[PDB]
């Protein structure tokens, strides 16, 4: 029960990344894709708790 927002690139190892995207530094925000071609198992559900 806490929220977090960030944009800095995550370093999975010892590689110093400060704005560049290395092979070990990945962007921690990955987006979806929502098309009618996808079936039931790949569609967005507005889950509310």
């Amino acid at each position: 029960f806490e929220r977090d927002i960030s944009t800095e690139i995550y370093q999975a190892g010892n590689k110093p990344c400060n704005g560049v995207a290395g092979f070990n530094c990945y962007f921690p925000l990955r987006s979806y894709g929502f098309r009618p071609t996808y079936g039931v198992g790949h569609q967005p559900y507005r889950v509310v708790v």
Partner: antibody, heavy 126, light 109 residues
Framework: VQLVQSGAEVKKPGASVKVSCKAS????????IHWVRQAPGQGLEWMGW????????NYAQSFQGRVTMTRDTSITTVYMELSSLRSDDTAVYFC????????????????????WGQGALVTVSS | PVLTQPPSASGPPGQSVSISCSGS????????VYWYQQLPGAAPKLLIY???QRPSGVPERFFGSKSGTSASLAISGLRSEDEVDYYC???????????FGAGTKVTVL
């Protein structure tokens, strides 16, 4: 996909010009449309995106009130109403087809410009 | 800041050439780089998107990649019958907008 339109007519500075390109072959409720001009000898400039679903269009840092946009759901063609034309407006107008959809300011990195075709030519004149 | 490019490049046919697009940390690497190419007397067209997937409509001839601050578009050989400028574009949080490169002329030798 097609972007067939008509050539833009020459306008005096301190007037208005209209460019609109036809949309067909798809539903015009998912693709935010962009406007852009190809400046000679250099790159291009961006001013904002137009969403045909909700009134949530924004503006860039350097373009506040020079550009004005209105949407249309009956004809599915965006309308352009430019104001205060100057000498640096001497460039051709192409309507930029953008894949996908994006509203907030952290989803636009994934989109890329899809279709260019038969753009308009506009040069403000003495 | 503004993305810059060399005004022109000189590559003879028969050998590979590359085009560099110098940038910064906040525009290149953490944000994807697109490459626009426009025909003379016609409409532009995207060459490569997301620096690793090639669009459908072009054969396996070109190559593009990014390395930190700069991105390289490898052009394996050159045909004398087609000479087309290359544009460099990216995204920057500070300008919260799309900023475009200078553009490059490619010529035969």
């Amino acid at each position: 996909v097609q972007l067939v339109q008509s050539g833009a007519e020459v306008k005096k500075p301190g007037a208005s010009v209209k460019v609109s390109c036809k949309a067909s072959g798809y539903i015009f409720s998912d693709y935010n449309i962009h406007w852009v001009r190809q400046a000679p000898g250099q790159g291009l400039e961006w001013m904002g995106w137009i969403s045909p679903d909700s009134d949530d269009t924004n503006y860039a840092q350097s373009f506040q009130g020079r550009v004005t946009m209105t949407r249309d759901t009956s004809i599915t063609t965006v309308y352009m109403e430019l104001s205060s034309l100057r000498s640096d407006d001497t460039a051709v107008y192409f309507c930029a087809r953008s894949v996908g959809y994006c509203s907030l300011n952290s989803c636009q990195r994934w989109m890329w410009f899809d279709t260019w075709g038969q753009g308009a030519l506009v040069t403000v004149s003495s | 800041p503004v993305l810059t490019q060399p005004p022109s490049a000189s590559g003879p046919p028969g050998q590979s050439v590359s085009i560099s697009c110098s940038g910064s940390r906040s525009n290149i690497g953490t944000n994807f780089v697109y490459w626009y190419q426009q025909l003379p007397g016609a409409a532009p067209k995207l060459l490569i998107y997301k620096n690793d997937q090639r669009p459908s409509g072009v054969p396996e001839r070109f190559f593009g990649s990014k390395s930190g601050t700069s991105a390289s578009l490898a052009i394996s050989g050159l045909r004398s019958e087609d000479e087309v400028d290359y544009y460099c574009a990216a995204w920057d949080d500070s300008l919260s907008g799309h900023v475009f490169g200078a553009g490059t002329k490619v010529t035969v030798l």
